[PDB]
């Protein structure tokens, strides 16, 4: 039955707009298959269109905003794009239709509407780009009855082992198509829908904009060798309308040109299913998809006071939709240094110098290919998977569709190598590599990342103790399925546990350190003088200089999170010997946290080093790090140490801002210094952790109930309002919020862990 619930998920999820890197495109969860992408641009001039054309997501003064208003990966949704440069408000309605044995059929409505500043008669080029990768597959454009283009529909007929037979229809569409007077309309026609059919070697079909512009150049060079001159040049649009050449290939460019408002549909009909898909199908399924989304939101995300008003429901739907609508499918080789050079051991003072020499041998090589099905931090800036980001992404996704979140966890853990390592940044394929500077491509098998995917497993387990809607909850509804999922994954979770203990180990034994355990001590590998990228808190102040004897309370707390989950998962599977060993490790962690990381002087936890004189020092930097035992849920509700930390959290002179908890105390000597990334600003992911724990230390008998209820109430309000205000004014979720102003700053479209607020608004954790 697990395979059956499993075969039903593959089929539900196969098709999607799973190319979050571009404004709108589709691909299935198959490495080498059929991909679509939308391009458009105003043409007012002979040279402008190369600058106005839109394909891959950016965020600059020329784009007001874009995002999904509703989305569910199983059904589809509606995307709005607000393009200032091109005077357009574009709508992408996308919807799926189950049927057949090939993950079904789908359709999309592209709707463009000039804004009030657009020339009422603006000319707008729209391209629909279709490519097919694969060895024994065919795609052909049926030619048109008309002489130099198509008057009505465009029919692509194709077949693959993976998809079998399908047809892809780009419709005539409503909207004024402009005609030309000029001599040139003897050879190209007056103006019509046109199709070019090409072949390139599979590995370049992703480079749609260069492929398009190679055909626009050819057809411009062709005017110049046919004596068409500056005396009487044709209109810019006609110069940039392609010569119809429909045929068979792995690339089909379908070009329309429109005067004023316009709209056309894409209907992909799977031959495995019955009747072909129609625009009447599109309108029915979209209306239906909207009611369903509406009903599911109101149940899954019941916004509690003071946020029950419609304005907050709207904001909630935006944050949630953009988070889940970022889901992408990624396929290709990764770049990995597999030397495991001895300098990566970092066992010498000045180890950062040694590790740079090793990197400077550039031994890294492409390996794979791999697949990842994951949400992303940001479409314009980070259209790829980040390991500890996804743990936060999936908390709200799991609530909506636990079966989807478990598909994504599975996808991530299938990347785990034999030693237990998952690269913290998944850059799969050339398409992914193009958005990434050459210096950040190389992954390093000693580089860890917080294991937040365990927190999603925690929520999965608590909901286990206690048709598309049937599928979404099947792995909790049918407990035999959940168990089987956890049984298959468990050995991976354990392999990663051991990988942290082998690769990220602190040195207790070799220094003058007294502790309750000689085993439990951790140090983040990968840190430079200013940075610790592997912890996720890029520039949070750590011991200076970096040193093999450093110990990292945030790493120790994450191991803690892992063990609590391994004990819980192990108990369910009956791993009785393993559970006994976990309970010993947990115990030792609780004690060593105190014996190595607690500052009675400063009333918080701290990273440790060893002195210029070879003895253990605590290095205390009041902020997110200082609270990690608490944030990760390891302190007992009556701990005197919890009491001391709650003080710190509520202390307006240290971490309490009107807009949320500051990354670093105002009182710390590194507050607002250097790139000031994790050195003052408000981060929603850590604020989320603080809030969840406060609600927990507030819903139990104990001495901090009342204190922790005030803090929960206020921190909940401050964070939600900060993110709502900014969403009202800018239309964006942001990576961080300014602690002096509550202004969103740095990365935009951060949905992303900023979308964590939707969960914060509904409460009941
Ligand atoms: C490629 C690049 C990076 C950076 N700065 C680093 C950077 C910025 C934004 C997001 C992140 C990723 N974040 C960082 C978070 O700290 C992680 O916790 C989290 O996992 C992760 C994913 O969300 N890194 C600056 C430039 C630049 C070019 C020109 C001027 N500047 C270019
Ligand atoms: C004030 C501020 C804004 C942003 N914005 C998002 C962002 C993210 C990553 C890379 C870039 C760089 N550039 C800027 C170029 O103009 C783009 O064309 C180009 O695509 C893009 C990506 O390379 N921007 C990030 C930071 C930041 C965080 C950490 C260190 N710095 C600070």
Tab-separated table of N, CA and C in Angstrom, residues 383-495:
chain	number	residue	atom	x	y	z
A	383	UNK	N	17.395	30.728	-6.875
A	383	UNK	CA	16.546	29.683	-7.428
A	383	UNK	C	17.261	28.326	-7.331
A	384	UNK	N	17.447	27.848	-6.097
A	384	UNK	CA	18.156	26.580	-5.763
A	384	UNK	C	17.956	26.250	-4.274
A	385	UNK	N	18.246	25.016	-3.900
A	385	UNK	CA	18.029	24.469	-2.551
A	385	UNK	C	19.176	24.802	-1.622
A	386	UNK	N	18.851	25.338	-0.444
A	386	UNK	CA	19.770	25.547	0.701
A	386	UNK	C	19.345	24.616	1.829
A	387	UNK	N	20.282	23.828	2.353
A	387	UNK	CA	19.966	22.726	3.303
A	387	UNK	C	19.138	23.234	4.509
A	388	UNK	N	19.604	24.187	5.323
A	388	UNK	CA	18.887	24.558	6.578
A	388	UNK	C	17.708	25.465	6.253
A	389	UNK	N	17.717	26.139	5.109
A	389	UNK	CA	16.534	26.919	4.655
A	389	UNK	C	15.320	25.984	4.535
A	390	UNK	N	15.480	24.799	3.934
A	390	UNK	CA	14.332	23.938	3.534
A	390	UNK	C	13.576	23.473	4.787
A	391	UNK	N	14.276	23.245	5.907
A	391	UNK	CA	13.672	22.887	7.208
A	391	UNK	C	12.617	23.893	7.630
A	392	UNK	N	12.852	25.163	7.326
A	392	UNK	CA	11.928	26.274	7.658
A	392	UNK	C	10.838	26.325	6.577
A	393	UNK	N	11.233	26.226	5.314
A	393	UNK	CA	10.303	26.256	4.160
A	393	UNK	C	9.182	25.241	4.395
A	394	UNK	N	9.527	24.032	4.844
A	394	UNK	CA	8.594	22.877	4.836
A	394	UNK	C	7.668	22.923	6.049
A	395	UNK	N	7.960	23.715	7.083
A	395	UNK	CA	7.062	23.763	8.267
A	395	UNK	C	5.672	24.200	7.814
A	396	UNK	N	5.529	25.284	7.021
A	396	UNK	CA	4.211	25.692	6.529
A	396	UNK	C	3.722	24.801	5.386
A	397	UNK	N	4.643	24.270	4.581
A	397	UNK	CA	4.253	23.344	3.480
A	397	UNK	C	3.695	22.025	4.069
A	398	UNK	N	4.340	21.495	5.103
A	398	UNK	CA	3.891	20.256	5.767
A	398	UNK	C	2.475	20.443	6.301
A	399	UNK	N	2.167	21.612	6.846
A	399	UNK	CA	0.818	21.843	7.412
A	399	UNK	C	-0.216	21.692	6.302
A	400	UNK	N	0.064	22.295	5.163
A	400	UNK	CA	-0.820	22.268	3.979
A	400	UNK	C	-0.846	20.892	3.317
A	401	UNK	N	0.309	20.254	3.186
A	401	UNK	CA	0.382	18.980	2.431
A	401	UNK	C	1.543	18.138	2.953
A	402	UNK	N	1.382	17.498	4.101
A	402	UNK	CA	2.479	16.709	4.729
A	402	UNK	C	3.114	15.719	3.754
A	403	UNK	N	2.348	15.201	2.807
A	403	UNK	CA	2.829	14.201	1.810
A	403	UNK	C	3.832	14.850	0.842
A	404	UNK	N	3.595	16.116	0.504
A	404	UNK	CA	4.496	16.934	-0.341
A	404	UNK	C	5.793	17.193	0.432
A	405	UNK	N	5.701	17.576	1.705
A	405	UNK	CA	6.896	17.917	2.503
A	405	UNK	C	7.748	16.653	2.611
A	406	UNK	N	7.126	15.487	2.824
A	406	UNK	CA	7.882	14.211	2.943
A	406	UNK	C	8.489	13.847	1.583
A	407	UNK	N	7.841	14.181	0.456
A	407	UNK	CA	8.471	13.958	-0.881
A	407	UNK	C	9.757	14.787	-0.962
A	408	UNK	N	9.725	16.010	-0.431
A	408	UNK	CA	10.878	16.952	-0.541
A	408	UNK	C	11.991	16.483	0.400
A	409	UNK	N	11.650	16.107	1.634
A	409	UNK	CA	12.650	15.524	2.575
A	409	UNK	C	13.322	14.321	1.898
A	410	UNK	N	12.531	13.407	1.322
A	410	UNK	CA	13.046	12.189	0.643
A	410	UNK	C	14.052	12.618	-0.439
A	411	UNK	N	13.654	13.587	-1.266
A	411	UNK	CA	14.439	14.123	-2.404
A	411	UNK	C	15.803	14.613	-1.904
A	412	UNK	N	15.814	15.373	-0.805
A	412	UNK	CA	17.063	15.897	-0.185
A	412	UNK	C	17.940	14.729	0.288
A	413	UNK	N	17.364	13.796	1.047
A	413	UNK	CA	18.134	12.700	1.684
A	413	UNK	C	18.654	11.725	0.626
A	414	UNK	N	17.989	11.609	-0.523
A	414	UNK	CA	18.527	10.824	-1.669
A	414	UNK	C	19.814	11.450	-2.210
A	415	UNK	N	20.247	12.617	-1.732
A	415	UNK	CA	21.491	13.245	-2.239
A	415	UNK	C	22.635	12.879	-1.305
A	416	UNK	N	22.311	12.367	-0.115
A	416	UNK	CA	23.310	11.993	0.924
A	416	UNK	C	24.288	10.993	0.316
A	417	UNK	N	25.586	11.278	0.398
A	417	UNK	CA	26.676	10.396	-0.085
A	417	UNK	C	26.940	9.294	0.953
A	418	UNK	N	27.922	8.428	0.685
A	418	UNK	CA	28.147	7.147	1.423
A	418	UNK	C	28.583	7.481	2.858
A	419	UNK	N	29.316	8.584	3.043
A	419	UNK	CA	29.874	9.075	4.339
A	419	UNK	C	28.796	9.783	5.181
A	420	UNK	N	27.684	10.230	4.587
A	420	UNK	CA	26.593	10.918	5.323
A	420	UNK	C	26.398	12.408	4.980
A	421	UNK	N	27.111	12.952	3.993
A	421	UNK	CA	27.192	14.394	3.627
A	421	UNK	C	26.144	14.747	2.572
A	422	UNK	N	25.435	15.846	2.810
A	422	UNK	CA	24.600	16.568	1.812
A	422	UNK	C	25.174	17.979	1.673
A	423	UNK	N	25.538	18.376	0.453
A	423	UNK	CA	26.040	19.728	0.161
A	423	UNK	C	24.972	20.711	0.639
A	424	UNK	N	25.383	21.828	1.252
A	424	UNK	CA	24.445	22.821	1.851
A	424	UNK	C	23.786	23.627	0.725
A	425	UNK	N	24.453	23.735	-0.415
A	425	UNK	CA	23.941	24.449	-1.609
A	425	UNK	C	23.869	23.459	-2.777
A	426	UNK	N	22.656	23.177	-3.248
A	426	UNK	CA	22.389	22.270	-4.393
A	426	UNK	C	22.312	23.101	-5.683
A	427	UNK	N	23.393	23.078	-6.472
A	427	UNK	CA	23.501	23.712	-7.818
A	427	UNK	C	23.551	22.600	-8.881
A	428	UNK	N	22.396	22.173	-9.381
A	428	UNK	CA	22.245	20.978	-10.239
A	428	UNK	C	22.021	21.399	-11.687
A	429	UNK	N	23.030	21.232	-12.531
A	429	UNK	CA	22.920	21.571	-13.954
A	429	UNK	C	23.483	22.946	-14.270
A	430	UNK	N	23.711	23.187	-15.555
A	430	UNK	CA	24.294	24.419	-16.104
A	430	UNK	C	23.330	25.589	-15.871
A	431	UNK	N	22.028	25.354	-16.036
A	431	UNK	CA	20.977	26.387	-15.853
A	431	UNK	C	21.125	26.984	-14.452
A	432	UNK	N	21.228	26.127	-13.438
A	432	UNK	CA	21.406	26.512	-12.020
A	432	UNK	C	22.761	27.213	-11.825
A	433	UNK	N	23.807	26.741	-12.492
A	433	UNK	CA	25.206	27.211	-12.319
A	433	UNK	C	25.341	28.640	-12.890
A	434	UNK	N	24.477	29.044	-13.817
A	434	UNK	CA	24.588	30.348	-14.521
A	434	UNK	C	24.225	31.488	-13.563
A	435	UNK	N	23.407	31.210	-12.537
A	435	UNK	CA	22.911	32.233	-11.582
A	435	UNK	C	23.916	32.350	-10.425
A	436	UNK	N	25.045	31.631	-10.491
A	436	UNK	CA	25.946	31.449	-9.311
A	436	UNK	C	27.365	31.868	-9.679
A	437	UNK	N	27.962	32.829	-8.955
A	437	UNK	CA	29.371	33.178	-9.168
A	437	UNK	C	30.286	31.943	-9.082
A	438	UNK	N	31.378	31.894	-9.866
A	438	UNK	CA	32.291	30.711	-9.995
A	438	UNK	C	32.832	30.373	-8.589
A	439	UNK	N	32.923	31.345	-7.673
A	439	UNK	CA	33.603	31.146	-6.369
A	439	UNK	C	32.709	30.356	-5.395
A	440	UNK	N	31.395	30.264	-5.629
A	440	UNK	CA	30.472	29.614	-4.664
A	440	UNK	C	29.929	28.301	-5.237
A	441	UNK	N	30.449	27.827	-6.370
A	441	UNK	CA	29.882	26.623	-7.038
A	441	UNK	C	30.387	25.362	-6.336
A	442	UNK	N	31.665	25.369	-5.978
A	442	UNK	CA	32.360	24.179	-5.448
A	442	UNK	C	31.730	23.840	-4.097
A	443	UNK	N	31.214	22.632	-3.968
A	443	UNK	CA	30.788	22.107	-2.657
A	443	UNK	C	31.969	21.389	-2.001
A	444	UNK	N	31.926	21.268	-0.677
A	444	UNK	CA	33.028	20.728	0.152
A	444	UNK	C	32.415	19.707	1.106
A	445	UNK	N	32.809	18.413	1.006
A	445	UNK	CA	32.267	17.353	1.858
A	445	UNK	C	32.566	17.443	3.361
A	446	UNK	N	33.369	18.410	3.806
A	446	UNK	CA	33.497	18.718	5.255
A	446	UNK	C	32.598	19.889	5.706
A	447	UNK	N	31.812	20.503	4.804
A	447	UNK	CA	30.999	21.716	5.079
A	447	UNK	C	29.602	21.250	5.464
A	448	UNK	N	29.211	21.470	6.729
A	448	UNK	CA	27.896	21.091	7.291
A	448	UNK	C	26.903	22.252	7.103
A	449	UNK	N	25.645	22.033	7.491
A	449	UNK	CA	24.578	23.059	7.566
A	449	UNK	C	23.587	22.618	8.639
A	450	UNK	N	22.960	23.545	9.400
A	450	UNK	CA	21.977	23.152	10.408
A	450	UNK	C	20.971	22.158	9.848
A	451	UNK	N	20.744	21.053	10.565
A	451	UNK	CA	19.787	20.032	10.139
A	451	UNK	C	18.331	20.322	10.531
A	452	UNK	N	17.779	21.394	9.985
A	452	UNK	CA	16.401	21.857	10.279
A	452	UNK	C	15.359	20.910	9.683
A	453	UNK	N	15.761	19.982	8.814
A	453	UNK	CA	14.802	19.049	8.163
A	453	UNK	C	14.302	18.077	9.240
A	454	UNK	N	15.062	17.943	10.332
A	454	UNK	CA	14.670	17.136	11.508
A	454	UNK	C	13.456	17.776	12.176
A	455	UNK	N	13.397	19.114	12.256
A	455	UNK	CA	12.268	19.832	12.918
A	455	UNK	C	10.964	19.479	12.199
A	456	UNK	N	11.040	19.259	10.886
A	456	UNK	CA	9.853	18.913	10.047
A	456	UNK	C	9.500	17.461	10.335
A	457	UNK	N	10.514	16.619	10.484
A	457	UNK	CA	10.285	15.229	10.913
A	457	UNK	C	9.615	15.235	12.299
A	458	UNK	N	10.109	16.024	13.261
A	458	UNK	CA	9.464	16.178	14.599
A	458	UNK	C	7.957	16.414	14.418
A	459	UNK	N	7.532	17.430	13.668
A	459	UNK	CA	6.095	17.769	13.489
A	459	UNK	C	5.371	16.578	12.849
A	460	UNK	N	6.021	15.892	11.917
A	460	UNK	CA	5.427	14.721	11.225
A	460	UNK	C	5.061	13.647	12.266
A	461	UNK	N	5.988	13.351	13.181
A	461	UNK	CA	5.890	12.309	14.254
A	461	UNK	C	4.770	12.659	15.255
A	462	UNK	N	4.637	13.919	15.708
A	462	UNK	CA	3.615	14.358	16.711
A	462	UNK	C	2.211	14.180	16.125
A	463	UNK	N	2.060	14.386	14.815
A	463	UNK	CA	0.770	14.294	14.082
A	463	UNK	C	0.467	12.824	13.775
A	464	UNK	N	1.439	11.940	14.030
A	464	UNK	CA	1.342	10.470	13.835
A	464	UNK	C	0.892	9.839	15.167
A	465	UNK	N	1.542	10.200	16.284
A	465	UNK	CA	1.064	9.926	17.672
A	465	UNK	C	-0.433	10.289	17.774
A	466	UNK	N	-0.826	11.525	17.438
A	466	UNK	CA	-2.247	11.985	17.417
A	466	UNK	C	-2.877	11.736	16.032
A	467	UNK	N	-9.870	13.727	-2.960
A	467	UNK	CA	-8.961	12.854	-3.762
A	467	UNK	C	-7.517	13.396	-3.728
A	468	UNK	N	-7.304	14.634	-4.200
A	468	UNK	CA	-6.040	15.409	-4.035
A	468	UNK	C	-5.912	15.803	-2.548
A	469	UNK	N	-7.044	16.052	-1.862
A	469	UNK	CA	-7.143	16.289	-0.388
A	469	UNK	C	-6.902	14.983	0.391
A	470	UNK	N	-7.271	13.829	-0.172
A	470	UNK	CA	-7.038	12.490	0.440
A	470	UNK	C	-5.542	12.182	0.376
A	471	UNK	N	-4.929	12.468	-0.776
A	471	UNK	CA	-3.506	12.172	-1.077
A	471	UNK	C	-2.578	13.002	-0.174
A	472	UNK	N	-2.958	14.262	0.082
A	472	UNK	CA	-2.176	15.276	0.838
A	472	UNK	C	-1.891	14.837	2.277
A	473	UNK	N	-2.723	13.971	2.874
A	473	UNK	CA	-2.624	13.549	4.302
A	473	UNK	C	-2.444	12.028	4.425
A	474	UNK	N	-2.257	11.307	3.318
A	474	UNK	CA	-2.238	9.822	3.266
A	474	UNK	C	-1.153	9.217	4.187
A	475	UNK	N	-0.036	9.910	4.443
A	475	UNK	CA	1.126	9.336	5.172
A	475	UNK	C	0.974	9.577	6.680
A	476	UNK	N	-0.099	10.268	7.093
A	476	UNK	CA	-0.545	10.295	8.520
A	476	UNK	C	-1.847	9.510	8.664
A	477	UNK	N	-2.775	9.613	7.708
A	477	UNK	CA	-4.082	8.891	7.728
A	477	UNK	C	-3.852	7.377	7.863
A	478	UNK	N	-2.915	6.819	7.082
A	478	UNK	CA	-2.553	5.377	7.025
A	478	UNK	C	-1.240	5.130	7.765
A	479	UNK	N	-1.267	4.843	9.084
A	479	UNK	CA	-0.058	4.901	9.905
A	479	UNK	C	1.026	3.918	9.443
A	480	UNK	N	0.617	2.842	8.762
A	480	UNK	CA	1.533	1.810	8.212
A	480	UNK	C	2.429	2.482	7.152
A	481	UNK	N	1.917	3.476	6.424
A	481	UNK	CA	2.695	4.224	5.389
A	481	UNK	C	3.736	5.118	6.076
A	482	UNK	N	3.317	5.951	7.030
A	482	UNK	CA	4.237	6.811	7.797
A	482	UNK	C	5.426	6.003	8.290
A	483	UNK	N	5.132	4.912	9.003
A	483	UNK	CA	6.137	4.001	9.615
A	483	UNK	C	7.121	3.559	8.529
A	484	UNK	N	6.607	3.166	7.368
A	484	UNK	CA	7.443	2.593	6.283
A	484	UNK	C	8.358	3.705	5.751
A	485	UNK	N	7.818	4.916	5.548
A	485	UNK	CA	8.600	6.132	5.177
A	485	UNK	C	9.760	6.296	6.177
A	486	UNK	N	9.444	6.331	7.480
A	486	UNK	CA	10.408	6.568	8.594
A	486	UNK	C	11.421	5.406	8.623
A	487	UNK	N	10.989	4.162	8.392
A	487	UNK	CA	11.882	2.965	8.365
A	487	UNK	C	12.937	3.131	7.258
A	488	UNK	N	12.526	3.522	6.043
A	488	UNK	CA	13.421	3.714	4.862
A	488	UNK	C	14.393	4.883	5.086
A	489	UNK	N	13.949	5.960	5.753
A	489	UNK	CA	14.721	7.225	5.938
A	489	UNK	C	15.663	7.100	7.139
A	490	UNK	N	15.204	6.459	8.218
A	490	UNK	CA	15.923	6.330	9.511
A	490	UNK	C	17.425	6.078	9.295
A	491	UNK	N	17.864	5.044	8.528
A	491	UNK	CA	19.294	4.761	8.384
A	491	UNK	C	20.075	5.967	7.838
A	492	UNK	N	19.414	6.808	7.028
A	492	UNK	CA	20.000	8.050	6.451
A	492	UNK	C	20.172	9.078	7.573
A	493	UNK	N	19.113	9.346	8.351
A	493	UNK	CA	19.142	10.268	9.525
A	493	UNK	C	20.289	9.848	10.444
A	494	UNK	N	20.396	8.547	10.742
A	494	UNK	CA	21.485	7.985	11.578
A	494	UNK	C	22.833	8.221	10.892
A	495	UNK	N	22.938	7.984	9.584
A	495	UNK	CA	24.249	8.129	8.886
A	495	UNK	C	24.698	9.596	9.034
